[PDB]
C-alpha cells in the first residue's frame with residue numbers, strides 16, 4: 001500500500017492522499033472503469049509531456065479494484081471556484097490580475113507545446129499553498145501536430161466554449177484565450193455569462209451573440225474591462241495570444257503571489273472549521 | 280421564504296418559489312400530472328424529485344416503483360403531447376412526487392410548442408445523455424422526442440445514472456445518432472416487460488417510435504400498482520432529509 005487515501009477534495013473524483021514512505025501529499029483521481037480509457041491515456045500523455053511549474057504534474061498510476069487511479073500534484077489552496085465558494089465572495093481585481101498572470105504563463109507554455117486545454121474555467125485553475133496558479137484537468141485537452149494544425153472536436157464546458165469551437169470550422173490554441181476571458185468574468189461575478197440558462201441554449205447563442213461583457217460594467221476598472229474585451233474577440237485569427245496578453249496593462253501590473261495570502265488563509269480556515277464540525 | 284430545495288425555495292399552503300416561456304407553457308397547462316404556476320411561485324411537491332429520492336436513500340428504484348412513476352409520467356406526457364408541447368428535458372431530476380406519491384412533470388424552461396405553421400421544432404436543446412437522436416441531427420422533431428428521454432429516464436431510475444454517464448457529455452451527444460439504442464448494463468436483472476418497455480422508448484426512428492398513449496398500454500405500465508407501493512420509498516427519503524437537516528443544527 002503506497003498511499004494512504006484520505007478525504008475527497010473540493011466542493012468530484014479526486015482524493016487527497018499521503019505517500020506512506022515520504023510523507024508527501026498528492027491528489028489521486030479515481031477513474032470509473034466505464035470511462036473511455038483511450039481518452040484517459042491522451043490525458044495522462046499530455047500531462048507527461050508538460051514540464052512547467054504552471055501545469056499540474058502527473059506522478060503515476062495504479063489499478064485497484066478494477067479502477068485506474070491517477071496520482072497527481074496536490075495544490076494546497078484548492079481551485080479558484082472552491083475559494084470563491086468557501087468564502088462566498090468574488091475576487092478583487094488585484095487577486096484576479098495575479099491569478100490570471102500565472103494562468104497566462106501556463107497557457108503560454110501549453111500553446112508553445114501545441115496543446116489546447118479546451119476546459120479553462122475557475123474550477124480548473126488550482127492554487128498551491130504559496131498562491132501559485134496551476135492549469136489542471138487535461139481530460140478534454142487537444143494536441144496539434146504537423147499533420148493536424150487545427151482541431152475539430154466540439155468539446156469543453158458550454159458557458160466557457162469559444163465561438164469557433166462550436167462553429168465546427170477548425171480551431172487552435174487561442175480558443176483557450178476566449179475561455180480565459182469568460183473565467184475572468186466568472187472570478188469577478190461568481191459565474192460566467194449565461195450561467196442561469198441552459199448550457200445547450202448557451203451553445204447556440206455564443207457564435208451569434210456579440211462578445212459578453214460584465215453584468216455591471218461601471219463597477220470595474222478600464223484595464224480590467226479592456227483585458228476581458230481582448231480575450232473575447234470573436235475572430236480567433238485576430239484574437240490575442242497568451243504571450244501578448246501577459247503584456248496587457250491589467251496583467252503586467254499584477255502584484256506578486258503575496259496579495260493572495262489572506263484569500264487563501266480565509267478559504268482554508270472555512271474548510272478547516274467545516275471539517276471540525278463534521279467530527 | 281424557507282430553505283432551498285439550484286434556485287427553488289420552499290393561507291397555510293406550501294409552495295415552491297426566455298423566462299416568459301417557462302411561465303406561458305405552465306399557464307396553458309391544467310393537468311394534475313403537470314406542476315402548476317401560481318403567480319416564480321409554483322406547486323410544491325412534498326417528496327422532491329425522483330433523482331433526489333434516489334440520492335437520499337442511496338438506492339435505485341424497484342421495477343414496481345418505476346412502473347408506477349412512469350405511468351403517472353406518461354399521463355403527463357400524454358396531456359402535454361395532446362397540447363402540442365414537447366417538454367425536451369425529461370429526466371429523473373424533472374419528475375417530482377407529491378407527499379401522496381403522484382408524479383408531476385416539472386421545469387418547462389426548455390419546452391417547445393408546435394403550431395399550425397410549425398409542425399416540427401429544430402432547436403438542439405435538452406440535457407445531452409437524455410436527448411433523442413433526431414433532436415441532435417437537426418432534421419426537425421416532434422413530441423416523441425420526450426419518449427426517447429423517458430426511456431433513458433427509465434434506465435436512470437433502475438441504474439442510478441443514464442447510459443454513457445462516464446463519457447464526456449459533448450462526446451456522448453455526437454455518438455447518440457450513430458450508436459445502437461442503449462440497453463441495461465446487466466440485462467439479466469430485469470423482466471422481459473421492463474426491457475421491452477425501454478426498447479419501445481428507444482426506437483431510433485421517431486416516426487416509428489410509440490406515443491405516450493400507446494406506452495400507457497404497454498404490459499410494464501398497464502400492470503402498475505397504485506401510488507401505495509411508493510409510501511415506504513417516500514417515507515425513507517423524507518426521513519433521510521430530516522435527519523440531515525437536524526445534524527445541520
Ligand SMILES: CN1C(=O)c2sccc2N(C)c2nc(Nc3ccc(S(N)(=O)=O)cc3)ncc21
Pocket residue numbers: 009010011014027028056072073074075076077078079082083086123124126136137271
Ligand atoms: C490534481 N488536481 C486536479 O487535477 C483537479 S482539476 C479540478 C479539481 C482537481 N482537484 C480537486 C485537485 N485538488 C487539489 N487540491 C485541493 C485542495 C483543497 C481543496 S478544498 N477547497 O476543498 O479545500 C480542493 C482541492 N490539488 C490538485 C487537484
Ligand SMILES: CN1C(=O)c2sccc2N(C)c2nc(Nc3ccc(S(N)(=O)=O)cc3)ncc21
Pocket residue numbers: 284287295314321322323324325326327328331332335372373375385386520
Ligand atoms: C416547482 N418545482 C420545480 O419546478 C422543480 S423542477 C426541478 C426541481 C424543482 N424543485 C426543486 C421543486 N421542488 C419541489 N419540492 C421539493 C421537496 C423536497 C425536496 S428534497 N428531496 O430536497 O427533500 C426537493 C424538492 N416542488 C416543486 C419544485
